[PDB]
Amino acid sequence: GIFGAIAGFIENGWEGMVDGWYGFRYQNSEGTGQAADLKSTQAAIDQINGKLNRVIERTNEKFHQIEKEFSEVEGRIQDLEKYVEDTKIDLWSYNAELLVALENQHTIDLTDAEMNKLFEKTRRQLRENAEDMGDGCFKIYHKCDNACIESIRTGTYDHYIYRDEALNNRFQSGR
Amino acid sequence: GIFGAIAGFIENGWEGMVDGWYGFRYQNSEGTGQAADLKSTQAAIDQINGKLNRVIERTNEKFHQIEKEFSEVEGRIQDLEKYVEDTKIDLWSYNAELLVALENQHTIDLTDAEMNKLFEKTRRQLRENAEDMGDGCFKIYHKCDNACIESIRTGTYDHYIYRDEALNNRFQSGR
Amino acid sequence: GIFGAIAGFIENGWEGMVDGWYGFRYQNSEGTGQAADLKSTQAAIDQINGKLNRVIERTNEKFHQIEKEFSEVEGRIQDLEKYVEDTKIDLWSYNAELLVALENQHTIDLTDAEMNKLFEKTRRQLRENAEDMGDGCFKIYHKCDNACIESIRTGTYDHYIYRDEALNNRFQSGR
Amino acid sequence: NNTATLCLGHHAVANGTLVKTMSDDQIEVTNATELVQSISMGKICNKSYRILDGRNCTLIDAMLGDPHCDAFQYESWDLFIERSNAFSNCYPYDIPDYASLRSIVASSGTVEFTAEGFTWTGVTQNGRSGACKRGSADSFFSRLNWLTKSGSSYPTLNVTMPNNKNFDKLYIWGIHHPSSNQEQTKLYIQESGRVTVSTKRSQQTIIPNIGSRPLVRGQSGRISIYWTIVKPGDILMINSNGNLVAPRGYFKLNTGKSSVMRSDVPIDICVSECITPNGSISNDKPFQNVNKVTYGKCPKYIRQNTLKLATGMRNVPEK
Amino acid sequence: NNTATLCLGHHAVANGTLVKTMSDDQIEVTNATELVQSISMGKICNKSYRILDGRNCTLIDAMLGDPHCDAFQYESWDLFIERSNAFSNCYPYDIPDYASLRSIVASSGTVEFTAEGFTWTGVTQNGRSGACKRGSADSFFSRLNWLTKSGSSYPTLNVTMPNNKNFDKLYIWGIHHPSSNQEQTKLYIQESGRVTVSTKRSQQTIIPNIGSRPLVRGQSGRISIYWTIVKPGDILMINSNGNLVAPRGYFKLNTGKSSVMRSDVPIDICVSECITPNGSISNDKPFQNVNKVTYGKCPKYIRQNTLKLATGMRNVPEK
Amino acid sequence: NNTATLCLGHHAVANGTLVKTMSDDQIEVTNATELVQSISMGKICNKSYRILDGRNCTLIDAMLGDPHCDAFQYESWDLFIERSNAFSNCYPYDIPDYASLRSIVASSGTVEFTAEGFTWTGVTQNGRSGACKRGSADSFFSRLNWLTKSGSSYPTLNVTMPNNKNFDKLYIWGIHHPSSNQEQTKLYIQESGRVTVSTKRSQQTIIPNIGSRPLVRGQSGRISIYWTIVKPGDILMINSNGNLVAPRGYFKLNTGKSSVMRSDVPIDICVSECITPNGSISNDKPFQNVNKVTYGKCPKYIRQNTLKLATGMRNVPEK
Numbered sequence A, B, C: 001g002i003f004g005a006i007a008g009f010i011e012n013g014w015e016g017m018v019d020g021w022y023g024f025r026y027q028n029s030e031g032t033g034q035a036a037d038l039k040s041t042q043a044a045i046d047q048i049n050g051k052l053n054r055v056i057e058r059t060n061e062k063f064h065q066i067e068k069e070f071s072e073v074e075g076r077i078q079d080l081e082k083y084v085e086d087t088k089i090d091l092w093s094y095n096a097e098l099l100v101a102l103e104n105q106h107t108i109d110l111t112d113a114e115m116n117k118l119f120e121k122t123r124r125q126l127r128e129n130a131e132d133m134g135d136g137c138f139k140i141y142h143k144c145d146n147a148c149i150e151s152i153r154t155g156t157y158d159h160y161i162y163r164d165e166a167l168n169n170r171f172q173s174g175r
Numbered sequence D, E, F: 001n002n003t004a005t006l007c008l009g010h011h012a013v014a015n016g017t018l019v020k021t022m023s024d025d026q027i028e029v030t031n032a033t034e035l036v037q038s039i040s041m042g043k044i045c046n047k048s049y050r051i052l053d054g055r056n057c058t059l060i061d062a063m064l065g066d067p068h069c070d071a072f073q074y075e076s077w078d079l080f081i082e083r084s085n086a087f088s089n090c091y092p093y094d095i096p097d098y099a100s101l102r103s104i105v106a107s108s109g110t111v112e113f114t115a116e117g118f119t120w121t122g123v124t125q126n127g128r129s130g131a132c133k134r135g136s137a138d139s140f141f142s143r144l145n146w147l148t149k150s151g152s153s154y155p156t157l158n159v160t161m162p163n164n165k166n167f168d169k170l171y172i173w174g175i176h177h178p179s180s181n182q183e184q185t186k187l188y189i190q191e192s193g194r195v196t197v198s199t200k201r202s203q204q205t206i207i208p209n210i211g212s213r214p215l216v217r218g219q220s221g222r223i224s225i226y227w228t229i230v231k232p233g234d235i236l237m238i239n240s241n242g243n244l245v246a247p248r249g250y251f252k253l254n255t256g257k258s259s260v261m262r263s264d265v266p267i268d269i270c271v272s273e274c275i276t277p278n279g280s281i282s283n284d285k286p287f288q289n290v291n292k293v294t295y296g297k298c299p300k301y302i303r304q305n306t307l308k309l310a311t312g313m314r315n316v317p318e319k
């Protein structure tokens, strides 16, 4: 991925998430829990659904055409009929190959984006109250129960509330 | 957008900017002001201008061809003439649909990039003297007049000058 | 580039690197040195190698066809033969133009990604022990010999070891 | 501890599948879909289009009126299926520019015939042949009238038939090539015959050609078949002093969704919207590898038998 | 306060517009441009190409020399417009392989004629017809010479005409089909005529075909028209013992940007570089939905009437 | 100092090169590759395909059996090269639908002939001509038998030849057009001849056409050449009362990778897998600007002479 999130800084996927495409796992004073993040999951899915219908016209009726199989050897005209068809097939075959590569590339990249987008969103919420652990994990420098975690997930988290406390736990150090 | 800047962490657009595509709004000791950032605006525009001329050949002269409308029912040959044209039209129709989707996708993405690129540029200038507020805003921990703001915009800003002062205002805290 | 790394925050390329595509230069207690980063170099190269073979079918045998040059003026049929070929050429010509633009765009972007991916990887390792200088350079707030630098390159670097020391050198300041 | 740690992730599945991107030949994702239809249904669905099974008959034969084709007499179709056991069983013939006539009739989508009152003065009508048995009696193509000498005369025929309807009429006619001058003069007084079918805007004269050809159902003579389109307001005119195989009326010519297909696959009771020689095929995928010969609402034919479209993020299993 | 806050943003507009991406069916951006030309100009621009309005004449007629087409006699064109009121007014005819001849002449881009001194020894020249009135007198196609019997003889014509120029000559000739043996022998001694036009490399013999056809401007006879290309250094040769409609010279054959178009739309004083049956259309867009029939510097024809290309960032209004 | 600084970078080269992206017309990268083959090899490689240099002979001539083409008698090819000095040197002829016959034979990929024992009872065989010298004696096309009157008779020929092999036979035959009734009756008793070549499923009658044509190698008469495909189990039949140029046997008709190409470029000892009129061209690039006429494993022909594919990151030199 271009963003280095999926299969990069995030070590690997969670099979335990039968719940959504993106989410959180947390360890706190109340224990450990897991919650899927719906907006992220939705943003991805929306882009992937009906993907092909944004390029390929809803398939079209076609009736009488040219002949494409022959019993007799005729030359000039049959030569042309065979070449017209052969040309048509080869050109569509290219189209289909390129389309798949393009779409898959796009899909891969937008999913890596959504992961990164969500990590970033969370990092920005926390401010200097937290620490980028490097494996897509935040060390949070204060007592954070389930209502606290839940608030970070809703986007209602207030760091000015925890600033003082965070600083204490953070700047305990120095030798 | 893949970068989560436009329509993401930046809440929305500024209709008040009749001035450029990207820029700053600031509140300081002298009041509040607004300035468009030209390099960003230019980088985007340059990519978007003449976009289509990098794929589609400057339109070409074409004179006598085949007939595409018929009075008489003829069979074999007219069958072929109709199919040749029908094939040509359907293939170009695909090309045009895919091209638009590709270009628009690219356009959307490069504009989101330029926004992010500029935020990032600014964040990097400021160092620990500032704070990522999360809505594409920086809390600057020192007295910063218009000449100060203007310097951040020119890329001449020197944080070593303000380090000491920033630290004071920042680390006033702890309980 | 969409990531603003290459030809952006990283000022320019190193001709002195006859060694790899991406890497580090460092100044420490033992002097100054330079080391290419293989994983990054490999990730890029792998994507760029055989690029075109993921879209274009391995070239195919084609024998007897239609005639494409004529001595006599014939009308209707020759009209069709010329138009069939003309159509075929124009359509492939488009394909080739678009393909090049698409691939090059992708190439540019994935290489900018790998640069950014590597900077980011390093930044994440260092934590608050370091400082984003803005030109893709880290100010490291502690004595860091070649074994120390080498550890950051291997991904074995431990910041908890240097935290205390870093803090001292960092927070010497304030007036 | 008295501080918390919060981690972000994405899901993975047990059964990942490989796809192709711009950057990778093979890369595993959480889900993929097939974009190419390669399985046919093995049979042609009698719905939703109107299918006519030609059985022992060709399309040309059913319209000309070969006796074993009599059942098709009243038929129209969306798609006419031409089988391979298909054979002829009437007087031996040939159609110069056969395929064209086959195509014209196929897209017209009917062999329905409107008889007209032609007058052939002083000639015997309804010439029959042992090569073309209706039941077990000598007969001839039902839509053609084989005219010969009456008494000791075959006068210049000069018959007319105006198109007063508001559509094009298609007229099918022919000429007879006898095997010997002996036979020629016997059936058609004059030593050398001819046919000049004409309108206000076109014309075609055909001269018969004496001589022996190989025996087909006991006969060494032959018939050559021609057509003529008469436009509304225009007028048909047949001029002949020998050898004319006369039309009995017209075929109404339609603009339509109709066609003909060579197939040996059986017809069955199902529903579908696309037909190939191999059978009906499914509609839902964008591409198709079953056959380049298609009729109806069909996915586009391509060379590859498989194409996978990623419908999920990259799959990164535990490790 | 004694500290500052600095925010980054991008612009928005009041009048955003929807486009289609790979990721979205509809998404609003700051600006979009139309890529498909769907409005025609309603008229054909007399500039920049050379347009010839066929008026009452077809292209074939103007070259053959139908009397009401006399005005086109000296003309050349880039594009020849064939109207629908267009009709014929000379002797009734037909051209086997008509479209081909139409195409050959269209791309040649001229009906300009160079007369040659042919010698038709012992036959009367300039046969005229009541069906082909010049002014209000019997006449004939101006580029053809209708030869008949002189006195009581029509000797085997054996005329020659070498190509000594350094280009291909196009020769237009014909044969006359009389309505009765009575008429045939009257105008051309021999009971059965023929024409053998030949060069060193090709040849064509055409036999006339006696018989009545429907009346066209009082005449039941007909003429069939043929052509022959004579290469530089080669030589034309016409051999006939009856029924020959002789050429009067040659047409110079050009390689050129020339063509013919069926259109009923009027011609007006404007400028443009692309022409369709619907009129001249604008050049600046890459695609076009007006007509698949085009001449000149034209955008490519496609099925869709609208395609929007984003030319600005995503539009996110206040909220 | 007692603290370290660590910088990240990417390489650059001295010799960067410009490419085109979606975002830029020209942008410098570390490396690019050419995707269009525009240099030909100047010669046709005798390997890997089987090339036959037609030299002075056309493909049609080599199969008919023009005396100067005798060397090709036993030949087969992958690709037959037709040169431009190429000329004819036997009796003057013409083939209606020439190109088709040329194409049929080219893809068959052989002029190898199997003689059959035809019986032409009561006619003299092996008619020769001064226009077709073998060595320096009168001769004729080796694969054709020119039959004329024996004594004072040319009886109706009625010869038969069944296809008992399990492939299609191709038979080449012809008719002779004499220059005067004087010549006609002299060589073929009857005033008017004819040829009716027929099978169970097709037939073709050709009538000769009397008259003078321009002299070619002293002769004013001509020959017209026709073909007939006889299917396995079917049967050939030739009926003629004059003017028949008889076949001497059959050509075996092949489905194959064979073809014909017009080229003046020399043949040389090298290896390659793609051939154009300009010479053999290299295989490795996906596109090609040398010629639209190609045979073999060829890159696709396009209009542009250059296309650069970036194979390295953006090149940003010191500054």
Ligand SMILES: *[C@@H]1O[C@H](CO)[C@@H](O[C@@H]2O[C@H](CO)[C@@H](O[C@@H]3O[C@H](CO[C@H]4O[C@H](CO)[C@@H](O)[C@H](O)[C@@H]4O)[C@@H](O)[C@H](O[C@H]4O[C@H](CO)[C@@H](O)[C@H](O)[C@@H]4O)[C@@H]3O)[C@H](O)[C@H]2NC(C)=O)[C@H](O)[C@H]1NC(C)=O
Residues within 6 Å of the ligand: D212, D213, D214, D215, F158, F159, F160, F235
């Ligand atoms: C030009 O030359 C050709 C070929 O030489 C001639 O055409 C042949 O003409 C003869 C008669 O003159 C034909 O002979 C007849 O053949 C019939 C077909 O036989 C086929 O099918 C049967 C099965 O029913 C098989 O035996 C066999 O496989 C054949 O393929 C027969 O049915 C006829 O049989 C009758 O005659 C016999 C013998 O006299 C009687 O005893 C029987 O009772 C029966 O009534 C008959 O023999 C021959 O088939 C023709 N061949 C072709 C290819 O058409 C032309 O006549 C000639 N033209 C001239 C001279 O102008």
Ligand SMILES: *[C@@H]1O[C@H](CO)[C@@H](O[C@@H]2O[C@H](CO)[C@@H](O[C@@H]3O[C@H](CO[C@H]4O[C@H](CO)[C@@H](O)[C@H](O)[C@@H]4O)[C@@H](O)[C@H](O[C@H]4O[C@H](CO)[C@@H](O)[C@H](O)[C@@H]4O)[C@@H]3O)[C@H](O)[C@H]2NC(C)=O)[C@H](O)[C@H]1NC(C)=O
Residues within 6 Å of the ligand: D158, D159, D160, D235, E212, E213, E214, E215
């Ligand atoms: C083969 O058979 C056909 C058809 O039966 C014959 O062709 C017809 O021949 C007759 C004459 O023998 C033609 O009759 C003539 O018709 C002319 C055309 O009339 C049309 O236009 C006028 C308007 O001007 C309308 O009245 C009408 O709608 C017609 O469509 C007339 O102009 C002629 O009129 C003259 O004769 C009358 C009656 O005798 C006189 O009183 C008048 O003064 C006037 O001079 C004439 O009547 C007929 O049109 C032909 N039909 C076709 C389709 O061509 C062939 O003759 C025949 N061949 C043979 C026997 O060999």
Ligand SMILES: *[C@@H]1O[C@H](CO)[C@@H](O[C@@H]2O[C@H](CO)[C@@H](O[C@@H]3O[C@H](CO[C@H]4O[C@H](CO)[C@@H](O)[C@H](O)[C@@H]4O)[C@@H](O)[C@H](O[C@H]4O[C@H](CO)[C@@H](O)[C@H](O)[C@@H]4O)[C@@H]3O)[C@H](O)[C@H]2NC(C)=O)[C@H](O)[C@H]1NC(C)=O
Residues within 6 Å of the ligand: E158, E159, E160, E235, F212, F213, F214, F215
């Ligand atoms: C229909 O009309 C045509 C054309 O008018 C006639 O065809 C011509 O017929 C005459 C004979 O009647 C031909 O004359 C002969 O021409 C031969 C070819 O000459 C060409 O090549 C030589 C080089 O060898 C050059 O001189 C020159 O450039 C020519 O292009 C000559 O070789 C013959 O020469 C013999 O005759 C002369 C004169 O009598 C003797 O002195 C010599 O010794 C020698 O034996 C001869 O002259 C003429 O070429 C024909 N033209 C064409 C185009 O075919 C038809 O005859 C006529 N049909 C009829 C009447 O039914």
Ligand SMILES: CC(=O)N[C@@H]1[C@@H](O[C@H]2O[C@@H](C)[C@@H](O)[C@@H](O)[C@@H]2O)[C@H](O[C@@H]2O[C@H](CO)[C@H](O)[C@H](O[C@]3(C(=O)O)C[C@H](O)[C@@H](NC(C)=O)[C@H]([C@H](O)[C@H](O)CO)O3)[C@H]2O)[C@@H](CO)O[C@H]1O
Residues within 6 Å of the ligand: D127, D128, D129, D130, D131, D138, D146, D148, D177, D178, D179, D183, D187, D215, D218, D219, D220, D221, D222
């Ligand atoms: C051994 C012998 O000579 N028997 C005579 C038989 O000879 C022919 O048998 C037929 C089956 C053919 O194979 C032929 O080649 C044999 O020589 C005679 O049979 C008739 O022969 C004539 C002419 O030779 C026709 O072949 C005729 O065919 C019909 C037919 O189509 O069945 C009769 C139709 O009524 C007639 N139709 C018309 C006039 O409209 C047609 C038509 O005339 C031809 O097909 C046109 O090409 O011919 C055979 O019945 C018989 C009777 O004369 O005598 C036997 O002794």
Ligand SMILES: CC(=O)N[C@@H]1[C@@H](O[C@H]2O[C@@H](C)[C@@H](O)[C@@H](O)[C@@H]2O)[C@H](O[C@@H]2O[C@H](CO)[C@H](O)[C@H](O[C@]3(C(=O)O)C[C@H](O)[C@@H](NC(C)=O)[C@H]([C@H](O)[C@H](O)CO)O3)[C@H]2O)[C@@H](CO)O[C@H]1O
Residues within 6 Å of the ligand: E127, E128, E129, E130, E131, E138, E146, E148, E177, E178, E179, E183, E187, E215, E218, E219, E220, E221, E222
């Ligand atoms: C009632 C009657 O019989 N009237 C005679 C009239 O009969 C014909 O009228 C014409 C208009 C036709 O419709 C015809 O069908 C009627 O029967 C005679 O008119 C001539 O008839 C002859 C032959 O029947 C021709 O039709 C002739 O046509 C011309 C022509 O083109 O106008 C005269 C031309 O000069 C002549 N051109 C030549 C020889 O180069 C042509 C040409 O011969 C034919 O078109 C070839 O097909 O014919 C009519 O003028 C007249 C005169 O005989 O007598 C009336 O009493």
Ligand SMILES: CC(=O)N[C@@H]1[C@@H](O[C@H]2O[C@@H](C)[C@@H](O)[C@@H](O)[C@@H]2O)[C@H](O[C@@H]2O[C@H](CO)[C@H](O)[C@H](O[C@]3(C(=O)O)C[C@H](O)[C@@H](NC(C)=O)[C@H]([C@H](O)[C@H](O)CO)O3)[C@H]2O)[C@@H](CO)O[C@H]1O
Residues within 6 Å of the ligand: F127, F128, F129, F130, F131, F138, F146, F148, F177, F178, F179, F183, F187, F215, F218, F219, F220, F221, F222
């Ligand atoms: C001056 C003169 O009259 N000389 C006589 C000469 O006349 C002809 O010369 C030839 C070369 C032609 O150009 C012709 O136009 C001259 O008039 C005679 O030459 C023969 O003429 C006849 C008929 O006019 C043929 O042209 C014949 O040609 C051959 C040939 O092909 O070379 C002889 C072949 O054996 C014969 N082949 C057959 C019968 O199978 C053919 C064939 O008959 C024709 O090509 C068919 O179209 O003709 C010339 O040899 C000679 C001999 O009569 O007398 C001179 O005095």
Ligand SMILES: *[C@@H]1O[C@H](CO)[C@@H](O[C@@H]2O[C@H](CO)[C@@H](O[C@@H]3O[C@H](CO)[C@@H](O)[C@H](O)[C@@H]3O)[C@H](O)[C@H]2NC(C)=O)[C@H](O)[C@H]1NC(C)=O
Residues within 6 Å of the ligand: D031, D032, D033, D034, D311
């Ligand atoms: C991963 O994707 C695959 C294929 O893309 C999924 O199977 C497919 O899912 C689609 C979308 O729902 C199915 O469409 C459905 O069809 C049924 C009956 O035809 C209809 O009742 C529904 O309303 C809907 O239209 C489709 O049938 C099916 N494709 C195939 C080939 O069976 C698959 O389930 C996905 N897997 C996961 C783990 O999400």
Ligand SMILES: *[C@@H]1O[C@H](CO)[C@@H](O[C@@H]2O[C@H](CO)[C@@H](O[C@@H]3O[C@H](CO)[C@@H](O)[C@H](O)[C@@H]3O)[C@H](O)[C@H]2NC(C)=O)[C@H](O)[C@H]1NC(C)=O
Residues within 6 Å of the ligand: E031, E032, E033, E034, E311
């Ligand atoms: C947003 O984009 C649209 C369309 O892309 C803009 O209108 C178009 O702008 C182009 C580029 O300048 C115009 O081209 C100009 O044409 C005139 C006269 O033909 C010429 O004098 C100029 O030199 C220039 O070439 C073009 O006419 C115009 N398109 C249409 C269909 O009118 C639009 O202005 C842009 N809107 C904003 C808010 O930026």
Ligand SMILES: *[C@@H]1O[C@H](CO)[C@@H](O[C@@H]2O[C@H](CO)[C@@H](O[C@@H]3O[C@H](CO)[C@@H](O)[C@H](O)[C@@H]3O)[C@H](O)[C@H]2NC(C)=O)[C@H](O)[C@H]1NC(C)=O
Residues within 6 Å of the ligand: F031, F032, F033, F034, F311
């Ligand atoms: C930058 O790229 C260019 C062209 O893409 C490089 O030259 C090309 O390199 C390829 C890949 O190795 C060469 O293929 C080789 O061919 C030889 C002999 O034909 C064979 O022995 C090798 O096993 C291999 O298949 C190719 O020949 C060559 N292209 C051309 C047109 O000469 C170039 O070296 C690269 N430059 C840098 C600085 O990396």
Ligand SMILES: *[C@@H]1O[C@H](CO)[C@@H](O[C@@H]2O[C@H](CO)[C@@H](O)[C@H](O)[C@H]2NC(C)=O)[C@H](O)[C@H]1NC(C)=O
Residues within 6 Å of the ligand: D055, D056
């Ligand atoms: C197709 O043709 C064959 C006849 O050639 C028909 O099947 C035959 O039926 C007849 C009795 O009516 C018998 O000769 C045989 O039992 C069958 N022959 C074979 C080869 O099986 C069949 O009925 C025809 N089909 C139609 C629809 O008429």
Ligand SMILES: *[C@@H]1O[C@H](CO)[C@@H](O[C@@H]2O[C@H](CO)[C@@H](O)[C@H](O)[C@H]2NC(C)=O)[C@H](O)[C@H]1NC(C)=O
Residues within 6 Å of the ligand: E055, E056
């Ligand atoms: C096209 O044809 C018609 C004649 O058929 C011409 O218009 C006619 O003019 C004549 C007098 O010259 C009269 O019969 C009528 O007033 C007109 N007829 C109609 C139907 O309007 C017209 O002039 C011709 N055009 C050209 C360029 O010659």
Ligand SMILES: *[C@@H]1O[C@H](CO)[C@@H](O)[C@H](O)[C@H]1NC(C)=O
Residues within 6 Å of the ligand: D038, D040, D277, D278, D289, D290, D291
């Ligand atoms: C379909 O039929 C064709 C013959 O028309 C045959 O060659 C092919 O194997 C069939 N294809 C499939 C996919 O069954």
Ligand SMILES: *[C@@H]1O[C@H](CO)[C@@H](O)[C@H](O)[C@H]1NC(C)=O
Residues within 6 Å of the ligand: E038, E040, E277, E278, E289, E290, E291
């Ligand atoms: C153009 O003319 C055609 C007939 O040639 C007609 O069907 C169509 O409506 C016209 N198109 C437009 C866009 O006006």
Ligand SMILES: *[C@@H]1O[C@H](CO)[C@@H](O)[C@H](O)[C@H]1NC(C)=O
Residues within 6 Å of the ligand: F038, F040, F277, F278, F289, F290, F291
């Ligand atoms: C190849 O030959 C053609 C003629 O067939 C000629 O026009 C052209 O210049 C040649 N092309 C090249 C690339 O040499």
